[PDB]
């Protein structure tokens, strides 16, 4: 059976024709750093960390050495297979990505047991799993925000007119509160902090009522640990020129639209998808901005696997 799969920065979903996600795991590799080899992918990597072996390293790639690709690919594809024969394998790449780069990716997934791979880029992906209506000769513009990267497209007739991305998404805004954090109260905190204050406090604006949180990092004078209270209001203001980029290649990618197509969908609205979507009111600020509709999609985290799996629905395009 035919399989769809989006190797994201955190996390792999494996989408199979028929029967759907059928794997979600870690993008995950671990290493012996004695050997420098691979010795389990995903949830594999994810026990023999938690059992800890040592002489190993865990590595999250997806943040692209060919061999590792193919490793990984080899290890998802089998385990998301009753098997029934090669797969047919359509791979989620980013926009940006080059040809001799998605040659690398479809050989290496030809290596790891696919009978033909095909790639297909991520916010084409998203907008298929979004349930745009993307074969119609009508306008329809997707914003998938996700750690690494925030692609913009519209879409129409089963083709990219005009896209956009940019290397300012979650991890960005995740760092963005690390150095207000630096430099508003000397207090240095780590990544796993800076998630979760996104994630329970952060906002793309209005923050009012999201509340207060209290957090730990290293205070830059002494090296000594630290406690101080963080406010919704001070996480929005850390986050503004995150957002107000993210506004931005939203505006430049309508600006090189062709009119008729910014019609459409200016009348249908603009989907967000992917984890990014999901800070507090970025959907109003972006429809602020924009003076136009804006709805984070049904199922934000799942889109571009599903849309990956529906594209199998159209091989002839990709193909
Ligand atoms: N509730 C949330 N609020 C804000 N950001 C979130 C939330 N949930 C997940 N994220 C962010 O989503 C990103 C991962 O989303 P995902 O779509 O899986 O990325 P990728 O396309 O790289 O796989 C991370 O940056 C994480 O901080």
């Given at each position: 059976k035919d399989l769809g799969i989006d190797l994201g920065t955190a996390n792999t979903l494996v989408y199979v024709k028929?029967?759907?996600?059928?794997l979600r795991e870690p993008s995950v590799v671990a290493i012996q750093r004695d050997t420098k080899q691979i010795v389990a992918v995903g949830n594999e990597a994810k026990n023999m960390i938690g059992r800890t072996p040592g002489n190993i390293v865990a590595l999250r790639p997806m943040k692209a050495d060919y061999e590792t690709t193919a490793t990984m690919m080899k290890y998802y594809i089998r385990k998301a297979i009753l098997f029934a024969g090669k797969p047919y394998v359509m791979v989620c790449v980013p926009y940006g990505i080059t040809a001799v780069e998605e040659r690398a990716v479809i050989d290496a997934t030809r290596q790891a047991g696919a009978r033909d791979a095909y790639t297909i880029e991520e916010p084409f992906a998203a907008a298929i799993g979004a349930n745009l209506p993307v074969w119609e000769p009508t306008g329809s513009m997707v914003v998938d925000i996700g750690g690494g990267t925030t692609e913009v497209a519209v879409i129409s007739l089963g083709g990219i007119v005009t896209s956009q991305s940019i290397r300012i998404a979650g991890d960005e805004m995740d760092e963005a509160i690390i150095q207000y954090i630096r430099k508003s109260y000397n207090l240095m905190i780590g990544e796993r902090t800076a998630e979760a204050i996104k994630m329970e406090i952060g906002s793309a604006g209005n923050p009012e009522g999201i509340g207060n949180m209290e957090i730990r990092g290293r205070d830059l004078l002494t090296g000594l640990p630290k406690t101080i209270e963080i406010s919704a209001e001070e996480v929005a203001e850390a986050l503004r020129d995150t957002v107000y980029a993210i506004v931005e290649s939203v505006k430049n990618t309508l600006e090189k639209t062709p009119p008729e197509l910014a019609a459409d969908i200016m009348d249908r609205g603009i989907v967000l998808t992917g984890g990014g979507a999901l800070l507090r009111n970025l959907d109003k600020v972006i429809s602020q901005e924009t003076d136009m509709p804006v709805i984070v999609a049904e199922n934000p985290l799942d889109c571009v696997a599903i849309g990956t799996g529906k594209a199998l629905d159209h091989i002839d395009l990709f193909k």
């Amino acid at each position: 059976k035919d399989l769809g799969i989006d190797l994201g920065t955190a996390n792999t979903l494996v989408y199979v024709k028929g029967k759907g996600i059928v794997l979600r795991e870690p993008s995950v590799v671990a290493i012996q750093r004695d050997t420098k080899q691979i010795v389990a992918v995903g949830n594999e990597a994810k026990n023999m960390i938690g059992r800890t072996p040592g002489n190993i390293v865990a590595l999250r790639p997806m943040k692209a050495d060919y061999e590792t690709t193919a490793t990984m690919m080899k290890y998802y594809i089998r385990k998301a297979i009753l098997f029934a024969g090669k797969p047919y394998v359509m791979v989620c790449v980013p926009y940006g990505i080059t040809a001799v780069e998605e040659r690398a990716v479809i050989d290496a997934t030809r290596q790891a047991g696919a009978r033909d791979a095909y790639t297909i880029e991520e916010p084409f992906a998203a907008a298929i799993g979004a349930n745009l209506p993307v074969w119609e000769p009508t306008g329809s513009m997707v914003v998938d925000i996700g750690g690494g990267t925030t692609e913009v497209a519209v879409i129409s007739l089963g083709g990219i007119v005009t896209s956009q991305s940019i290397r300012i998404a979650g991890d960005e805004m995740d760092e963005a509160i690390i150095q207000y954090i630096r430099k508003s109260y000397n207090l240095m905190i780590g990544e796993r902090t800076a998630e979760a204050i996104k994630m329970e406090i952060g906002s793309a604006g209005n923050p009012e009522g999201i509340g207060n949180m209290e957090i730990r990092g290293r205070d830059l004078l002494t090296g000594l640990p630290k406690t101080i209270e963080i406010s919704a209001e001070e996480v929005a203001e850390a986050l503004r020129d995150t957002v107000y980029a993210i506004v931005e290649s939203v505006k430049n990618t309508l600006e090189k639209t062709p009119p008729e197509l910014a019609a459409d969908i200016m009348d249908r609205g603009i989907v967000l998808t992917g984890g990014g979507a999901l800070l507090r009111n970025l959907d109003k600020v972006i429809s602020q901005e924009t003076d136009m509709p804006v709805i984070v999609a049904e199922n934000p985290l799942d889109c571009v696997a599903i849309g990956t799996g529906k594209a199998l629905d159209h091989i002839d395009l990709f193909k």
